[PDB]
């Protein structure tokens, strides 16, 4: 929150006050800005860097299976592209990645 | 009572380089103090070369007392040691 | 590369010798000022060492 008092260009701070309601108040000059029914937010959009789909491109020319997608209330697709991958230890089951062909929303299981 | 008998000797029968050096130094110090020699010295004067000649055909009167770390010692005749 | 006869045996050297003037400098470090030998001599008053 970076806002400055229009009267004297000094930094504005938020205090609780006696009433318990927050206001944008200036500690230098007699100025306040109540926010009852008014929204204030200082959004800090963090930078987003491009990421490669580490599982993308693997659902091409592979066998299909008859598994219902979890979003059954929105669609009823049955055929899904499935394949097997070992991403765990050798003494526990080798996981399956399978994606619906109609709605996307990829998901995996063990 | 700490002497290991001659039959039960376990240390290697080869004379180490340090034993050779100490034996030569001791014999040269003895000869430099007018000790008799047991070789036919051919005009040699330096005690160290006389000591080397004495060791050459094993005519030197000393023995080596090797201390094992426990405390028992082991006596080896210099003429017995293989060089 | 000149062809030099050796002064010891007189025969021609079997390789041509790179022969010519080079500027050489005599440096100030001479062995007359560097040689030293002690045997016994003065000793320090505190530690009684040379």
């Amino acid at each position: 929150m970076l806002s400055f008092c229009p009267s004297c260009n000094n930094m504005l701070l938020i205090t609780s006050g006696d009433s318990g309601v927050y206001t944008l108040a200036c500690r230098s000059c007699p100025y306040e800005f109540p926010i009852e029914g008014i929204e204030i937010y200082d959004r800090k959009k963090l930078p987003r860097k491009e990421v490669d789909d580490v599982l993308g491109g693997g659902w091409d020319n592979v066998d299909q299976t008859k598994t219902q997608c979890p979003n059954y209330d929105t669609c009823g697709g049955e055929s899904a592209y499935f394949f097997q991958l070992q991403i765990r230890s050798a003494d526990e089951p080798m996981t399956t990645f399978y994606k619906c062909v109609n709605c996307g929303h990829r998901w995996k299981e063990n | 009572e700490k002497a290991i008998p001659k039959d039960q000797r376990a240390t290697t029968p080869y004379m180490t380089k340090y034993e050779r050096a100490r034996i030569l130094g001791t014999r040269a110090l003895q000869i430099s103090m007018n000790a008799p020699v047991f070789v036919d010295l051919e005009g040699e004067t330096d005690p160290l070369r006389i000591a080397m000649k004495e060791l050459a055909e094993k005519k030197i009167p000393l023995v080596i007392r090797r201390y094992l770390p426990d405390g028992s010692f082991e006596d080896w005749s210099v003429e017995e040691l293989i060089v | 590369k000149d062809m030099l006869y050796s002064g010891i045996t007189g025969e021609c050297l079997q390789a041509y010798i790179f022969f010519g003037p080079i500027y050489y400098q005599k440096l100030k470090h001479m062995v007359l000022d560097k040689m030293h030998a002690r045997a016994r001599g003065p000793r320090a008053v505190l530690t009684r060492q040379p």
């Binding site: - | 240390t11 290697t12 080869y14 180490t16 380089k17 340090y18 090797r66 | -």
Partner: protein, 49 residues
């Protein structure tokens, strides 16, 4: 005979100051070592010391 003689004379002779020998045999290559830049198995972003 030759093999047995070479083996029996290759033993560490008692009384050897082997610790000092090892200390020198480790320190002296440190003198001979020049400082170079290395990397860990073909990737240039490591620069392992």
């Amino acid at each position: 005979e030759i093999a047995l003689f070479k083996y029996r004379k290759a033993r560490l002779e008692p009384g050897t100051a082997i610790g000092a020998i090892g200390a020198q045999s480790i320190g002296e290559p440190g003198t001979q070592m020049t400082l170079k830049t290395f990397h860990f198995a073909g990737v240039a972003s490591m620069n392992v010391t």
